[PDB]
Amino acid sequence: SIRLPAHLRLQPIYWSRDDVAQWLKWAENEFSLSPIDSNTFEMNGKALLLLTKEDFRYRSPHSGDELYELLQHILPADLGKKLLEAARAGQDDEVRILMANGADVNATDNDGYTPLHLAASNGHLEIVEVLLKNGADVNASDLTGITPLHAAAATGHLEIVEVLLKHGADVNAYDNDGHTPLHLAAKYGHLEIVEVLLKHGADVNAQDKFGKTAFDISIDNGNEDLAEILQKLN
Ligand SMILES: [Cl-]
Ligand code: NA
Ligand code: NA
Ligand code: NA
Ligand code: NA
Ligand code: NA
Ligand code: NA
Ligand code: NA
Ligand code: NA
């Protein structure tokens, strides 16, 4: 038995093509495989993770199934949890690889956050787009009632707000405090998001648990520019 080199103990998404080649040679020795042909897996580790098991079998009639299993065993068991983390951290390529390997696009943590909530909150537009294209629940509430549109409106991510609306986000969804996305955009001073929400049917007269409209919130915060938009339309 041979120990795997230290840089190959990194997750395979980080492996170069030369790293892949070293891993193959390590496996040839560790598992007593038929000699591996040097031109056979001419790609980096990110690409390797997108091959199917059938692809491995075709590429290596003698060892490809074994190599596929070895590679998959390197990955953590809970890909849905990894997807939540990758989406939160903006790891767009990792998001794509994890969903290709079966991660649930609607993976949910103990706060009710989904990948879409986390990518929306942290401004990761490309990840929002890939999640939506692959069936992400656009109107899922988290435990406090926050939808992805709430999360993008509160955090000032205008393009994400627009994409969520184009994919069916509920413009007048309520969180557990009765806040709509319009309330949260007003609370955090995002004037352009307020305009987009109104153009998509946001209810200026919606009252939260405190009896307050988005306009009331703009007055409490002294944000006269936001109050002006809201006043015009109600
Ligand atoms: Cl999953
Ligand atoms: Na590379
Ligand atoms: Na290298
Ligand atoms: Na090949
Ligand atoms: Na696969
Ligand atoms: Na290994
Ligand atoms: Na999983
Ligand atoms: Na889940
Ligand atoms: Na940001």
Author numbering: 2 to 235
What does the paper say about this structure?
TELSAM is a pH-dependent, polymer-forming protein crystallization chaperone which, when covalently fused to a protein of interest, forms a stable, well-ordered crystal lattice. A point mutation of the TELSAM motif causes it to be soluble at pH ⪆ 8 and to polymerize into well-ordered helical polymers at pH ⪅ 8. Target proteins can be genetically fused to TELSAM, which promotes crystallization by ordering many copies of the target protein along ordered TELSAM polymers, which associate to form the crystal. To address these challenges, we designed multiple constructs with several types of linkers—rigid (helical fusion), semi-flexible (Pro-Alan), and flexible (poly-Gly)—of varying lengths to fuse a designed ankyrin repeat protein (DARPin) to the TELSAM C-terminus.
We observed rapid crystal dissolution during harvesting but were able to harvest several crystals quickly enough to outpace complete dissolution. Unlike the rigid linker constructs, this construct lacked a 10xHis tag. The DARPin was observed to form four unique crystal contacts per asymmetric unit. The first involved van der Waals contacts between side chains of the host DARPin and various side chains of a neighbouring DARPin, mediated by acetate ions. The total interface area was 1855 Å2, the greatest observed among all the constructs. Upon opening the well for crystal harvesting, acetic acid molecules undoubtedly began evaporating, shifting the equilibrium of the acetates remaining in solution toward the protonated state, and raising the pH of crystal drop. This increase in pH likely began deprotonating the carboxylic acid side chains, causing them to repel each other and disrupt the corresponding crystal contacts, resulting in rapid crystal dissolution.
